[PDB]
Design a protein around this ligand. Structure first.
Ligand code: SF4
Ligand SMILES: [S]
Length: 153
């Protein structure tokens, strides 16, 4: 089976600051070598540029510090992630922690003050609502196990 992965976790320079969040993982490298780790960046897919200003959720809305509302792009990117999972038969996602799109256990609190809180990004929320299990880069053993359990079926 294949998984969808935040493109930044695969070393792609698609982060809001033009950086990457490439993780060191023999398991993830091997999965990619087998063609089973499909890269996806909801913000770029949703039409946002790179670089782009930091954004935080404010409930259903997603805004930048200047007040620009980018919810349209965030929601488009989330739908496109779901569309790729449905088309490819994907039921597991490995998404970047803390992001207003990809966060799964934590997100910034919407006050633009460097304070995190329990929560999830727009893309994680939509995927979970449709039965797709989302794991962060802090849960690689858990994700690898979940994917391994269905291997011989
Ligand atoms: S939207 Fe998600 S995949 Fe794209 S750069 Fe941000 S954290 Fe990574
Ligand atoms: S990002």
């Amino acid at each position: 089976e294949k998984i969808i992965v935040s493109a930044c976790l695969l070393g792609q320079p698609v982060r809001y600051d033009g950086q990457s969040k490439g993780i060191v993982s023999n398991w993830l490298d091997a999965l990619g070598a087998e063609g089973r780790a499909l890269a996806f960046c909801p913000e770029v897919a949703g039409g946002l540029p790179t670089p782009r200003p930091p954004a935080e959720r404010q409930g259903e809305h997603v805004v930048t510090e200047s007040g620009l509302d980018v919810t349209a792009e965030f929601d488009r990117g989330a739908e496109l992630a779901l569309g790729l999972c449905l088309a490819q038969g994907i039921r597991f996602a490995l998404l970047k922690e803390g992001s207003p799109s990809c966060g799964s256990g934590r997100i910034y609190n919407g006050r633009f003050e460097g304070v995190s809180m329990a929560g999830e990004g727009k893309t994680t929320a939509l995927l979970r609502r449709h039965g797709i299990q989302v794991f962060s880069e802090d849960q690689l053993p858990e994700l690898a196990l979940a994917l391994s359990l269905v291997a011989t079926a």
